[PDB]
């Protein structure tokens, strides 16, 4: 199973330095040349370097040719992306990619934002209601963090049908917030128990939450 | 650098008809070896993009055969014999032959229903743990309608609010073709305890008349 294991997203001044991470396994590594896209906030997909198998070729655009440099440990089967001299205009999703421009596999992307602003981790608080009667609604409210994302799960990703994660929002403060919910049959209020796994990276905030079916 | 233009860029088609779409490039991308290099991507939302077909019309194993990529020259097309659940998504093209390589804006493929699907409706409270820190957030939850137009209206003790909620929308769900939307009105811990009903009222094409869901800050 091919698999592109990319590191944690971060938040960068501008003009600051990162560098990204992305563990290849299950293909021959060393056969393949490797590619960095990025998505930027508007969705559009832009190409930022790609590199030879064995990293005697390295390819840029001019937009970030003597800022970003691509590198490959062949033994680790690790591909690297250093950047340097940052701009409000990298901030993006950054996806690794196998093959140099023929992208057949892609990872899970890295977010990278750049600002002045610092990182806020965010405060996680159930939602339920204080009460038709067929479906019922439990929720968790992950509130003021910087920058994205956020990621959530329900029951350690036991729980897909009827789970509902929205995009987030961006309050005045300037902080991000978003909402996660599960529409269940009242009947399983019963006997199961429902718990969001929330995962702010940016901060190393990790939490779950069991959210319980009556208010206090 | 090769400019690719797609059209359209929103597209809605009802469930099981075909649906088209076309990626234009500045420049021919016929190179030398004879050989093609246009390619087209899905992204599921919260997805990874997942290469659908990588030549003109070589389709990716595992893709139904209702995809077929077509094209020479300057104009390409993305065709979908019968549009299923699992085909909504964000339809990228791209070419992958010469520097720097480049993409297209990107195609939003939305499915289209014969009939409406009534929004359920619930509200949140705040947390009592949220009430400590001095916020109070209450959330109005419309599961699972279509079309995506709803009203949403907060009202405190009939007071109509406007300028302190959000609201979120989830992308299409693949199972029934419905959205589901949340509305968060924030308030402070103290202007929350300085009134009593809470009320978030929906109007959509799914229900017959306005449907008002509400609390009481302290009867609950």
């Known amino acids: 199973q091919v698999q592109l294991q990319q590191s944690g997203g971060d938040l960068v001044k501008p003009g600051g330095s990162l560098k990204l991470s992305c563990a290849a396994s299950?293909?021959?590594?060393?056969?393949?040349?490797m590619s960095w896209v990025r998505q930027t906030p508007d969705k559009r997909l832009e190409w930022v370097a790609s590199?030879?198998?064995?990293?005697?070729?390295?390819y840029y655009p001019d937009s970030v040719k003597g800022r970003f440099t691509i590198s490959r440990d062949n033994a680790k089967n690790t591909l690297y992306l250093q950047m340097s001299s940052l701009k409000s205009e990298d901030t993006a999703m950054y996806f690794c990619?196998?093959?140099?421009?023929?992208?057949?596999?892609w990872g899970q992307g890295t977010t990278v934002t750049v600002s002045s602003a610092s990182t806020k981790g965010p405060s996680v608080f159930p939602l339920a209601p204080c009460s038709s009667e067929s479906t019922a609604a439990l929720g968790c409210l992950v509130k003021d963090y910087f920058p994205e994302p956020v990621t959530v799960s329900w029951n350690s990703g036991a729980l897909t049908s009827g789970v509902h994660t929205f995009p987030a929002v961006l309050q005045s403060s300037g902080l991000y917030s978003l909402s996660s919910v599960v529409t269940v049959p009242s009947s399983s209020l019963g006997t199961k128990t429902y718990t969001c796994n929330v995962d702010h990276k940016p901060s190393n905030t990790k939490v779950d939450k069991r959210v319980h079916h009556h208010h206090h | 650098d090769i400019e690719l233009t797609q059209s359209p860029l929103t597209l809605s088609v009802i469930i099981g008809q075909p649906a088209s779409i076309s990626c234009k490039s500045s420049?021919?991308?016929?190179?030398?070896?004879?050989?093609?290099?246009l390619n087209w991507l899905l992204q599921r939302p919260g997805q990874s993009p997942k290469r659908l077909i990588y030549?003109?019309?070589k389709v990716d194993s595992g893709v139904p055969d209702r995809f077929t990529g077509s094209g020479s020259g300057t104009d390409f097309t993305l065709k979908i014999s019968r549009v299923e659940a699992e085909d909504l998504g964000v339809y990228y093209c791209?070419?992958?032959?010469?520097?720097?390589?480049?993409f297209g804006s990107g195609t939003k493929l939305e499915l289209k229903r014969r009939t409406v699907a009534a929004p359920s409706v619930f509200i949140f409270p705040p947390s009592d743990e949220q009430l400590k820190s001095g916020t109070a957030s209450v959330v109005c939850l419309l599961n699972n309608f279509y079309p995506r137009e709803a009203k949403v209206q907060w009202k405190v003790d009939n007071a109509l609010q406007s300028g302190n909620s959000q609201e979120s929308v989830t992308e299409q769900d693949s199972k029934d073709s419905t959205y589901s939307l949340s509305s968060t009105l924030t308030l402070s811990k103290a202007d929350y305890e300085k009134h009593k009903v809470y009320a978030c009222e929906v109007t959509h094409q799914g229900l017959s008349s306005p449907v008002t869901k509400s609390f009481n800050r302290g009867e609950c």
């Open positions: 990619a196998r093959q140099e421009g023929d992208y057949d596999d």
């Open positions: 299950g293909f021959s590594f060393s056969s393949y040349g």
């Open positions: 590199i030879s198998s064995g990293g005697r070729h390295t």
């Open positions: 420049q021919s991308l016929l190179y030398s070896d004879g050989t093609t290099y």
């Open positions: 030549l003109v019309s």
């Open positions: 791209w070419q992958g032959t010469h520097f720097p390589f480049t």
